[PDB]
Nucleic acid binder design. Structure first.
Ligand SMILES: *O[C@H]1[C@@H](O)[C@H](n2cnc3c(N)ncnc32)O[C@@H]1COP(=O)(O)OP(=O)(O)OP(=O)(O)OC[C@H]1O[C@@H](n2c[n+](C)c3c(=O)[nH]c(N)nc32)[C@H](O)[C@@H]1O
Ligand SMILES: Nc1nc2c(ncn2[C@@H]2O[C@H](COP(=O)(O)CP(=O)(O)OP(=O)(O)O)[C@@H](O)[C@H]2O)c(=O)[nH]1
Ligand SMILES: [Mg+2]
Ligand SMILES: [Mg+2]
Lengths: 333, 100, 27, 729, 726
RNA sequence: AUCUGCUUUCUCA
RNA sequence: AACUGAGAAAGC
RNA sequence: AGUAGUAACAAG
């Protein structure tokens, strides 16, 4: 009986922070293909549509939305090919539909995929997908980021007078039917991102007596725009707009899907147990612990090689340091 | 019975309550700061921020993914016709020849 | 019960009397 | 097809395995073999559907001519599988086959769909013939209540509905003719005649009938509208922060209108009593109150019923008072009497002590039930007399039972011997009297057993009756059978021209119940009729918005800043007993903050609303002292003077005020010196800070000890966990 | 270079208000792979190590190694302990009875009445039951039917009485049979290379002790799609013999729980939220003035491992004190069966040669047939620790613990009884809690924090006395006002956690119309009671329609998507004049919004459909919906209410004999339903044979047809002849 | 005054 | 080789 | 190889 391969213990990789920063940034293209919705009649429906305008205009023009749509479409096509061609090697192009501010529609080809034998009788049975994806990033910049990828240099492109090298990242990845199905359903990452923020808007409305979506996003004559603690720049807390926070939460949910496995589930559960204690501390509830090191070990056993979990631990430590500073501010009372 | 057994129960059986202070909240997972460990590699199914999508303006007519990819490669004929593998990086157990 | 059923049967293609006794409740 | 079925049975018995299955298996065990399944069913239907849709022929056809109409291939698209494997295999088709049928297939009859799904068509009709008001953004307190999901015209218990369905659809194999088969004979016959010309599957018809009859009740969060026509739109009606005014279509039962009217009148009176000149405010609100889609005045005029609150509002509005009451199936009219309700630890027959509502004093009611009438005279927990008229036996029994329960006779309470639940599975308080009524309606034998029997009247007209509903030689004790303008005071007291109060605001039931219909208040101050949490949040939001002006007036003015409409509305949720003490305590604390340099803005906001009622100081002229100011409604509705509260918490670090779950910011209205300022000067009325925890003084002194201190006497006060201080008078 | 830190959202929004962000339920739930034997052996070892200090003996009935931690030495440390004290449990039950006078008597009366009116059909309400005749997992109905047939072979006809009591009497009598003969299923292996396994049903016979072990055997497997846990766990399924009495025990415990103010069961959803909110409000209002109230959010570690079926037997006897002796014995059976429960270790372990590229499956009976050095370190240690309790036939003796945990209600009763003490030694603290099966939320009111912690420590020790092990790692305490109970996060009120119901937002995968209705209703209910605002509700509608169109390939008719269904959809779009009435499945537009989420799609579009399309869609005889049988009834549902056969194909396995038996039963049931149309709606009762009922029904129908003139005289003669020969 | 038939999915335990 | 209990939803 | 993670798939 062969020893099980334990997930490796890896350190924080700076590329996860870069992924979070770039996926939250506003691009110029729309990938969401949200279908029509029946005409509004009730004032509740009109309020919902008005709020959706802001929320989607924030999320829709973000790189995370394009990545999510690419994942959804590719997993749909991959499941279709796997069931249609179980005993054939199929080329499944990595494709997406994008729309810019001008309404122009573009077909985006991010690469090709080879769908090997896919006699996926079981739900967890694995089909190997060989992905040849175009990119502009030079792997040598962050070699530690690309030990799984064979990268060639196939040409160049001119987004403008500038010249950008093009590389072909080749990786023999794999996936099962469950992963394909949940990829076809990655659109839910929108809802969890919207609801959390939408609730906040609703809260503000109850404090102001009127719909506060425009005030929260842009700020009206009576209310300044909502600003959230979005991140850090040179060790100083930075403030982002409401839409930036919405995009950050949407990116967090998209990464939950992309890097979601047992490690992330366990880390989420245990770190939530710890987050509740931190909140009790912030509320001056005088929380008492019984075995804190045991809870910490439960949290830490889930941090092995999931990039999102490792970066979440790093962000948790940073946020905990900031909360400790805030408590230091609170002590003088 | 309960009071009797509690009296004769070992004192070592305690819930060990401890008032929580911010100092007790050490950073979680210190090993991730260990530079002796490898950086967590990129293991996502597809490239998220490094993705390069070749763009092809459409005409409101989605024929097929195969034809879409063919047209997009035809627009960027320089990349399609590249038959010279300029290997930049290689995975240890991969076969750059077979991959190309 | 046996005597009652015997009397009912003695009392009894198209029989004049259908029997409701000597059968389960549901039937 | 009896002959064909017999031939099929013989054919099946020709098979030994089927023969033994039929012979050995009993009728009860059929239900087991009906579920026989050798291969376990898969457990990821979503994945299975996504997998099958990406295949050729996932759908299964039904053998017949209609399946033959589907072409094998349509424009190169193979709709259905080839038929070269007919032998004991089956047939399959693609979703493209379904689309082809919808495009070019035969045009069938839709009458069956209209009949079966008439419930959903009525739902659509209610939605379409409905009007929408305006969406209001503000706090909404939703209570989890067991409400009916969909409207019904005849709701019956599930077993009764099942028997009715069996009679309608399966008259032959229906079993024993039960009480339901008789009391619903008309409906059963009507449905049978209506369903006579139908070829729809009997099981589908049965489910249609149960949807039409069986009532689906679920626990849902509701806010002022529990009628099923509103529950079906609950998702759009309101949330935790917004409320959509909705007017459903279709006809509404007058019972819901009466219940909503009672709730509206009770809310109006509760909000008006604290107001100066309560009559004027009550009239003003009632003139702008709409029950679902009709004004409150019209509902009061057109409803021959209500309660004390409805009568008070009618008198205020000019309508005559209808001194009528409803106690379930029993309808009563107060001929004369007077009684003040109290909570009594009544001992029930099965050894249960309950805080039941007990009335006192002589009271006479013209009572009626079904088609029977009578006169009930009662006193505190006793039925003095009950003169009933001749009517049907069942109606007379119902009237007698309901009058016994209404009189709250001690024998009636002692007559409970069985399972009676006065608390729902969710811990919510069920009405004790109605539960007793429900128990005694069915298990009525013990009530008459314990009531006692005396000699039947021998008078000229009075003849008594017994449990058989006949003029027996012995009558029920206190029961006999016979064959034979107001003015309203400023304080909402109904007085006869003689000078006697007949009803008052204090006589209005304090119960706060959700309205059956949606009560709207077409006034700018429509939030003043909300629940405790809504009122608290709105009042504190008003304080925050006007915090600058309130604080400026407080520093400059002396007494004119304590009187506001918002605080008047907030007073309606402070109990009258503690309102004056709270006002005195809060005013003293605010004045002590102002006179000294200690001004905790959070404490000023917290205590300001309570400084509305006239102060009621202690006998020595010093204000009362409180740790928590308890507000009306719910155990968690209170304000902590020192600690945070579920309704009011302050975070100095972020200067964030969490009120009823909503976070406002005091950043901008604050002084940086306030954080360093001590909380000990804004906790006890007439107390300032002198130093830290002094061991010599002793242990922390409680409110009772603190109130008894002398001037200049130091003591230990624990502001909250981990924060002790030393205070002086 | 600003770096985005999502946790900084918590600097503004409190954790509970943003708790939904802490649930990664948009990702794939973890799935177990391969064998579950490792986890089963782990749970066996954990149970026995938590009960090892107890009394170890050998069962004279089965020969298995039994461990009894009850009444054992009190634990001297904080490790999971199964050494429950009978005196302490009985004292807790007496305290609860004093708190609730007559509660036990009423619960016992209700359970006994339900048992007296309960039928054997109640045993068909299970997903997968350990069928002892085939020693596998079979659907509960299949296992029950096979058990009944085997009992018939053994002259055990109590099931024929129609009640659960006689069938359970047969169950306990079968243990006394010297040998049990039953219908098993074997398979012939044909080499074609491929080893095709053709199964056939034969007759087998086993001894008394083997049958006893099988009846007491629990079949173990691995749970799939579990969320929130790093490591996979094992689950177990019982047989009919155990479930029969577990039903009654669970019903009694449920009757008890429904009348306990500190129980989170059987209430759920909004009812549970109301109960918990009321309890929290009461405990907040009952805080002594100036005192400190502290809430402990606590989880119990190794709940099933440490719970002892002997303690549950004691609880059953204490509860059913006033019941007739027959009911007391009936309720005692289930804890007795679970105290002698045997665990089937599963599929065994796979041993592989990497250089030779070979793998083989060593089954549990052959687990020790190879040197332990050929297993990995963890498996080697697990097998070494399992050996004393290992049974040569390939099972493990698991007398302690509640591996299956089928006593959720009874365990809740035990936890509440633990909560009922409320004080020890008249100290200055009072605790009252909320108790689900194992999760709990304690509330201790005292004069200061020190006394609150004293009370919490006393509660911990008392739970240890009752066999309950509060998890110090996962449990924490704060001031009353914030806590968590059964993943419900209370912060001055239960906040809305929108992520938990997120996984159900997708296409339910039943059929097009059913999935449409399910998605719309899920959106509606999440709006009602999960904090989903109108904007998020409309976005959810959009996303559901997108997923629906990409699942059923029913994109908008005017869209440019291409597919086998899409060509006909476009043809329908061109043909249709009232395009707004076309269903989404037929490429029609989506007219759903918030106001009409509660109206079915066809009803919503009924007045917008074209008459031609409406008639084609709502054809009473459309072939895509299963009909009942021309004489076939009219299927009212539309063409989209179709069914995809749930094809349970197994590679290299042609279950023709099993399918034949299933189809024989199906034919008999179909004929019976044709004779008795009410069978589908109302369950047909009767102790007589199905053939007798069908014959009498057909005779009456034929006589009525003859008298009424429906049937000809010659046809009536034919019917009478056929019935006579029947 | 609302309390006094099963199957499947999701969540929780 | 997808268990137990509870809740909601859908279908028969 | 890879997916994945305490044990599996990489067809039978
Ligand atoms: O829905 C609640 C309440 O609004 C509703 N109700 C009450 N009255 C009516 C009328 N007249 N029409 C329609 N609906 C009505 O029934 C529920 C009662 O809740 P609650 O408000 O708590 O009732 P209350 O607190 O008043 O006590 P309750 O015993 O239920 O009596 C309600 C009603 O009956 C009168 N009443 C009862 N009893 C036993 C009385 C008595 O002994 N003596 C006198 N004088 N009156 C008695 C109550 O006073 C109310 O009139
Ligand atoms: N029969 C089942 N019971 C379950 C299941 N999930 C939870 N539970 C019950 O709830 C209890 C909680 O188990 P958890 O899944 O939380 C196990 P966890 O590792 O978190 O706790 P410990 O390892 O016992 O400390 C468990 O003991 C069972 O009694 C399940 O899938 N099946
Ligand atoms: Mg847990
Ligand atoms: Mg818990």
């Amino acid at each position: 009986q062969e020893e099980p391969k334990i997930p490796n213990k890896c350190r924080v990789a700076a590329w996860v922070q870069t992924e979070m920063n770039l996926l939250s940034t506003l691009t110029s293209k729309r990938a969401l293909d949200l279908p029509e919705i029946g005409p509004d009649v009730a004032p509740v429906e009109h309020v919902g549509s008005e709020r959706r305008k802001y929320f989607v205009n924030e999320i829709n023009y973000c790189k995370a939305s394009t990545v999510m749509m690419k994942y959804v479409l590719f997993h749909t096509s991959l499941l279709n090919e796997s069931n249609a061609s179980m005993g054939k090697y199929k080329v499944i192009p990595i494709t997406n539909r994008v729309v810019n501010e001008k309404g122009e529609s573009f077909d985006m080809l991010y690469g090709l995929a080879v769908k090997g034998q896919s006699h996926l009788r079981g739900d967890t049975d694995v089909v190997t997908v060989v992905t040849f994806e175009f990119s502009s990033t030079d792997p040598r910049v962050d070699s530690g980021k690309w030990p799984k990828y064979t990268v060639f240099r196939i040409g160049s492109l001119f987004v403008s007078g500038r010249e950008k090298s093009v590389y072909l990242y080749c990786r023999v990845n794999g996936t099962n039917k469950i992963q394909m199905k949940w990829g076809m359903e990655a659109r839910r990452c929108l809802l969890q991102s919207m609801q959390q923020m939408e609730a906040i808007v609703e809260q503000e409305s109850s404090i102001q007596g009127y719909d506060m979506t425009k005030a929260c996003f842009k700020g009206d004559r009576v209310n300044s725009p909502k600003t959230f603690s979005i991140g850090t720049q040179e060790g100083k807390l930075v403030k982002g707009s409401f839409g930036k926070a919405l995009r950050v939460i949407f990116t967090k949910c998209l990464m939950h899907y992309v890097f979601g496995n047992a490690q992330l589930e366990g880390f989420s559960a245990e770190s939530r147990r710890l987050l509740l204690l931190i909140q009790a501390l912030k509320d001056r509830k005088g929380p008492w612990v019984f075995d804190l090191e045991g809870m910490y070990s439960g949290i830490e056993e889930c941090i092995s090689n999931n990039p999102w979990v490792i970066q979440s631990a790093y962000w948790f430590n940073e946020w905990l340091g900031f909360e400790k500073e805030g408590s230091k501010v609170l002590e003088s009372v | 019975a309960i009071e009797r057994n509690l009296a004769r129960m070992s004192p070592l059986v305690s819930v060990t309550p401890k008032k929580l202070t911010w100092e007790d909240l050490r950073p979680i997972g210190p090993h991730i700061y260990n530079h002796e460990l490898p950086e967590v590699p990129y293991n996502a199914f597809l490239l998220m921020s490094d993705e390069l999508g070749l763009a092809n303006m459409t005409e409101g007519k989605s024929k097929k993914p195969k034809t879409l990819a063919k047209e997009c490669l035809e627009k960027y004929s320089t990349l399609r016709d590249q038959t010279d593998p300029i290997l930049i990086m290689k995975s240890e157990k991969a076969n750059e020849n077979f991959l190309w | 019960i046996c005597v009652h059923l015997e009397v009912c049967y003695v009392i009894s293609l198209r029989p004049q009397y259908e029997v409701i006794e000597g059968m389960p409740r549901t039937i | 097809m009896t002959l064909a079925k017999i031939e099929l049975l013989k054919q099946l018995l020709r098979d030994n395995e089927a023969k033994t299955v039929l012979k050995q298996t009993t009728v009860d065990q059929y239900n087991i073999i009906r579920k026989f399944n050798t291969s376990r069913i898969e457990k990821n239907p979503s994945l299975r559907m996504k997998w099958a849709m990406c295949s050729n022929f996932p759908l299964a056809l039904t053998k017949g001519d209609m399946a033959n109409r589907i072409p094998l291939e349509y424009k190169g698209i193979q709709l259905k599988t080839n038929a070269e494997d007919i032998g004991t295999k089956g047939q399959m088709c693609s979703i493209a086959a379904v689309t082809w049928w919808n495009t070019y297939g035969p045009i069938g009859d839709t009458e069956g769909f209209e009949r079966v799904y008439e419930s959903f068509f009525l739902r659509k009709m209610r939605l379409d013939n409905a009007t929408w008001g305006r969406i209001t953004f503000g706090p909404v307190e939703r209570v989890r209540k067991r409400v009916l999901l969909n409207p019904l015209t005849k709701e019956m218990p599930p077993d009764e509905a099942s028997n009715v369905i069996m009679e309608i659809l399966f008259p032959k194999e229906a079993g024993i003719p039960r009480e339901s088969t008789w009391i619903h004979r008309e409906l059963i016959k009507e449905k049978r005649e209506k369903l006579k010309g139908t070829m729809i599957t009997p099981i589908v018809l049965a489910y249609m009938l149960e949807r039409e009859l069986v009532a689906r009740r679920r626990f849902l969060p509701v806010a002022g509208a529990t009628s099923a026509e509103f529950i079906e739109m609950l998702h759009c009606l309101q949330g935790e922060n917004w409320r959509q005014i909705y007017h459903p279509g279709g006809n509404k039962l007058t019972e819901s209108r009466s219940q909503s009217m009672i709730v509206a009148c009770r809310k109006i009176i509760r909000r008006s009593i604290v107001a100066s000149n309560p009559l004027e405010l009550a009239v003003e609100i009632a003139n702008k109150t709409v029950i679902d889609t009709e004004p409150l005045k019209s509902c009061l005029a057109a409803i021959d019923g209500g309660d004390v609150a409805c009568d008070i509002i009618r008198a205020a509005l000019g309508l005559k008072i209808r001194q009528r009451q409803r106690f379930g199936r029993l309808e009563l009219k107060r001929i004369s009497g007077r009684g003040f309700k109290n909570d009594e630890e009544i001992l029930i027959g099965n050894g249960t002590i309950q805080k039941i509502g007990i009335w006192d004093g002589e009271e006479e009611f013209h009572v009626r039930c079904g088609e029977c009438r009578g006169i009930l005279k009662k006193s505190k927990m006793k039925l003095e007399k009950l003169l009933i008229n001749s009517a049907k036996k069942e109606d007379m029994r119902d009237l007698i039972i309901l009058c016994m329960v209404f009189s709250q006779d001690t024998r009636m309470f002692q007559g409970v011997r069985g399972e009676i639940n006065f608390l729902n599975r969710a811990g919510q308080l069920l009405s004790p009297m109605y539960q007793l009524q429900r128990y005694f309606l069915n298990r009525s034998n013990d009530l008459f057993d314990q009531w006692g029997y005396e000699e039947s009247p021998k008078a000229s007209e009075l003849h008594g009756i017994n449990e058989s509903m006949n003029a027996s030689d012995y009558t029920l004790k206190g029961v006999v059978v016979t064959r034979n303008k107001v003015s309203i005071t400023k304080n909402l007291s109904l007085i006869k021209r003689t000078g006697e109060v007949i009803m008052g605001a204090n006589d209005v039931s304090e119960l706060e119940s959700q309205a059956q219909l949606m009560i709207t208040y077409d006034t700018p101050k429509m939030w003043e009729m909300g629940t405790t949490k809504e009122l608290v949040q709105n009042t504190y939001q008003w304080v925050l918005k006007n915090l600058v002006t309130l604080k400026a007036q407080f520093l400059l003015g002396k007494e004119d800043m304590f009187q506001w409409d918002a605080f008047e509305a907030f007073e309606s949720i402070i109990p009258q007993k503690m309102a004056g003490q709270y006002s005195g305590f809060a005013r003293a604390v605010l004045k002590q903050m102002r006179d000294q340099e200690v001004m905790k803005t959070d404490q000023f906001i917290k205590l300001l609303p309570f400084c509305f009622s006239p102060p009621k100081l202690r006998s020595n002229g010093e204000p009362y002292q409180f740790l928590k100011l308890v507000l009306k409604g719910g155990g968690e509705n209170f304000i902590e003077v020192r600690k945070g509260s579920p309704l009011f918490s302050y975070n100095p670090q972020t200067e964030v005020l969490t009120i009823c779950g909503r976070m406002m910011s005091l950043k901008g209205k604050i002084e940086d010196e306030e954080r360093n300022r001590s909380m000990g000067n804004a906790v006890l009325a007439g107390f300032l800070v002198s130093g830290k925890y002094d061991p010599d003084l002793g242990d922390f002194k409680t409110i009772e000890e603190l109130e008894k201190l002398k001037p200049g006497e130091k003591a230990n006060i624990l502001l909250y966990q981990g924060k002790p201080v030393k205070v002086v008078k | 270079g600003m770096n985005i830190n999502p946790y900084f959202l918590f600097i503004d929004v409190p954790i509970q208000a943003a708790i939904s962000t802490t649930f990664p339920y948009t990702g794939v739930p973890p799935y177990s792979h391969g064998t579950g034997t490792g986890y089963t052996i782990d749970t066996v070892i954990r149970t026995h190590e938590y009960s090892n200090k107890g009394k170890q003996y050998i069962s004279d009935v089965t020969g298995c190694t039994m461990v009894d931690p009850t009444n054992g030495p009190l634990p001297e440390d904080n490790e999971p302990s199964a050494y429950a004290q009978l005196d302490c449990v009985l004292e807790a039950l007496d305290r609860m009875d004093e708190e609730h006078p007559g509660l036990f008597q009423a619960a016992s009366q209700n359970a006994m009445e339900t048992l007296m009116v309960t039928t054997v059909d109640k045993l068909t309400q299970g997903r997968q039951t350990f069928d002892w005749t085939v020693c596998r997992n079979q659907p509960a109905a299949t296992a029950l039917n096979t058990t009944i047939t085997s009992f018939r072979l053994n002259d055990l006809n109590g099931a024929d009485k129609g009640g659960l009591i006689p069938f359970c009497q047969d169950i306990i009598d079968s243990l006394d049979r010297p040998e049990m003969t039953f219908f098993s299923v074997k398979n012939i292996k044909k080499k074609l290379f491929l080893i095709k396994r053709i199964p056939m049903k034969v007759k087998d016979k086993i001894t008394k002790v083997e049958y006893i072990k099988r009846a007491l055997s629990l079949n173990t497997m691995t749970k799939d799609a579990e969320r929130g846990k790093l490591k996979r766990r094992a689950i177990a399924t019982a047989g009919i013999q155990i479930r029969g009495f577990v039903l009654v025990v669970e019903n009694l415990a449920k009757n008890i729980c429904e009348n306990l103010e500190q129980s989170g069961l059987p209430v759920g959803g909004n009812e549970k939220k109301a109960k918990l909110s009321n309890a929290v409000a009461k405990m907040l209002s009952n805080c002594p003035p100036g005192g400190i109230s502290m809430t402990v959010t606590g989880d119990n570690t190794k709940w099933n491992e440490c719970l002892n079926p002997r303690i549950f037997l004691a609880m059953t006897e204490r509860i059913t004190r006033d019941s007739p002796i027959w009911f007391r014995d009936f309720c005692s059976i289930a804890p007795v069966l679970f105290s002698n429960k045997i665990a089937r270790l599963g599929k065994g372990f796979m041993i592989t040669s990497k250089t030779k590229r070979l793998k083989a499956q060593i089954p549990c009976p052959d687990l020790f047939s190879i040197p332990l050095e050929r297993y990995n370190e963890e498996t080697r240690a697990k097998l070494k620790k399992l050996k004393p309790f290992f049974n040569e036939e390939g099972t493990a003796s698991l007398s302690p613990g509640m591996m299956m945990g089928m006593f959720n209600m009874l365990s809740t009763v035990l936890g509440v009884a633990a909560l009922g003490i409320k004080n020890i030694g008249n100290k200055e603290y009072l605790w009252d809690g909320l108790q689900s099966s194992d999760d709990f939320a304690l509330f201790v009111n005292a004069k200061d924090e020190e006394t609150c912690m004293e009370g919490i420590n006393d509660f911990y020790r008392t739970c240890k006395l009752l066999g309950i092990n509060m998890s110090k790692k996962k449990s924490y305490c704060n001031e009353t006002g914030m806590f968590e109970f059964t993943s419900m996060f209370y912060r001055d009120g239960f906040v809305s956690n929108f992520a938990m119901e997120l996984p159900s937002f997708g296409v339910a995968g039943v059929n097009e119309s059913a999935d449409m209705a399910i998605g719309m209703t899920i959106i509606k209910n999440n709006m009602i009671n999960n904090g989903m605002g109108p904007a998020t509700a409309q976005t959810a509608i959009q996303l559901f329609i997108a997923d629906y169109r990409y699942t059923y390939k029913c994109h908008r008719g005017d869209s440019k998507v291409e597919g086998k269904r899409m060509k006909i959809i476009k043809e329908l779009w061109e043909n249709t004049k009232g395009r707004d009435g076309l269903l989404v499945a037929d490429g029609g537009p989506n007219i759903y919004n918030l106001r009409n989420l509660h109206i079915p799609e066809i009803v919503l579009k009924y007045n917008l459909m074209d008459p031609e399309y409406k008639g084609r869609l709502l054809h009473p005889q459309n072939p895509f919906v299963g009909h009942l049988s021309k004489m076939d009834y009219d299927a009212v549902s539309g063409t989209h209410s179709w069914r995809t056969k749930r094809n349970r194909s197994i590679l290299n396995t042609d279950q023709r004999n099993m399918i034949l038996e299933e189809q024989c039963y199906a034919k008999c049931c179909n004929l019976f339903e044709a004779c008795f149309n009410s069978a589908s709606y109302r369950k047909p009762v009767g102790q007589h044979s199905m053939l007798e009922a069908m014959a009498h029904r057909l005779r009456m129908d034929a006589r009525l047809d003859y008298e009424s003139g429906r049937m000809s005289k010659d046809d009536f003669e034919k019917a009478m002849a056929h019935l006579g020969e029947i």
